[PDB]
Amino acid sequence: SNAMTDAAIAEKDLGNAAYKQKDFEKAHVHYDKAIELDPSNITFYNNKAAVYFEEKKFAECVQFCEKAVEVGRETRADYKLIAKAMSRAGNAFQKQNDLSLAVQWFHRSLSEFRDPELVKKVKELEK
């Protein structure tokens, strides 16, 4: 789109390079800068969620998944990337030993985009 939205992407790319080295602090710095430049881009919220998940900050991961979903809907982003946020949230809830919330999110995710592996995973979790 514009000078700002390109600038944001460039910060995301810097965040990914830190993320790839497991420098999670620096990854957040850059993704935060991305969101500062262009808060309408779902990718930044999902990438921050992914960092939080690897840090075992599962409640923060969920919070950013929730942001991705809200942003994704407001901006009419690719519904598949909204589904990804939803499954990530489900996984973060599993890691918190919260099956109830995990399954709520997984069902959201499947309704957003039918992931064949997740369908099987959810049936197993509901056994």
Q: Where do the structural domains in the chain lie, given as residue ranges?
A: 1-127
What is the distance between the alpha carbons of residues 77 and 43, in angstroms, rounded to a whole number?
Answer: 10
Residue 114 burial by Cβ neighbours in a 10 Å radius (0-12, 13-18, 19+): exposed
* Structure resolution, Å: 1.9
CATH architecture group of domain 1-127 = Alpha Horseshoe (1.25)
Angle between helices 42-54 and 3-20 (to 10 degrees): 20
What is the distance between the alpha carbons of residues 73 and 61, in angstroms, rounded to a whole number?
Answer: 18
If you write DSSP's letter for every residue of 21-59 in order, what string do you get? Answer: TT-HHHHHHHHHHHHHH-TT-HHHHHHHHHHHHHTT-HH
What is the distance between the alpha carbons of residues 31 and 125, in angstroms, rounded to a whole number?
Answer: 33
